[PDB]
Amino acid sequence: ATKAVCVLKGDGPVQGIINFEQKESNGPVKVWGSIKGVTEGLHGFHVHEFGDNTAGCTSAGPHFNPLSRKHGGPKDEERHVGDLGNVTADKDGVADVSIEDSVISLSGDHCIIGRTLVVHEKADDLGKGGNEESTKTGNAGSRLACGVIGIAQ
Template identity: 30%
Template sequence: MKMRIAVVAIAAPLSLGACATIPPQNSASTLATAALINTSGQSVGSVEITQNGTAMLFRANVSGQAAGEHGIHLHTTGKCEAPGFTSAGGHLNPTAHQHGSLNPAGPHVGDLPNIVVGTDGTGMIEGPLTGTAAVVLASVFDTDGTAIVLHAGPDDYKTDPSGNSGGRIACGVLMRFPA
């Protein structure tokens, strides 16, 4: 009888431990989304900005694009008027840095890595945003909003102010999520 009590005394805590809730590995919350449109007004992709603790992250998916590398950046104004999308303004740069991760005086908040588009016309990229959560949140959700712009060519990561990434071929306005 003493042996059974010992087994129950050991097994009970182990079985209760199995009922403990395991926290999710990815607790990122979506902060903003954007639908990318091309100069003809057609949907060509989507963008999502998330926060995981103090890390600010972005994810972009594109389709119907020329194969190769394309610059993609956050821009100062949440406006996307075709055909040139110049209404989006310049790169988001609240900290007054120069452009590019290879520039000793850079990067600024609007700088993102190039997105690589495959021969099927699709591409996906995800990664961290430059700057603290406080700076990113304040600048993305300011009074005039923020756009994300896809460029025709690759960003060289050093030429101020825009990385020589060519014309603006798609644009989306970041909308706070949930709206």
């Protein structure tokens, strides 16, 4: 069993804690936790390529895309490795996150450790938005909060 963790921080405050667990290196990653301080509704949720927060979340770069694919949703074959969909916030501005993903990993070439988890301003259209930007970013807008994914006990 392999474990990772990420503390999300952004202005608001937007605060999040997200845990990752992978029982076996050829198996799925469960992702769970909570994010508070965001508006009710959908917020895009992705792994970005670099664990660089030197000048904020912008420093993380584009979606983690080791296989050079187009943007999609997590259930799509055509997706970036970092494409984890949306999290959904309630009227209290709390998003409870419960995901299982078979494409991210905590070891090997799809490893997300040392990269940045980002929660976005707007909904991710899952690449179904019918513009060029949909197939790159999902039209999810600015970066509300982020943190580097680290190895956990």
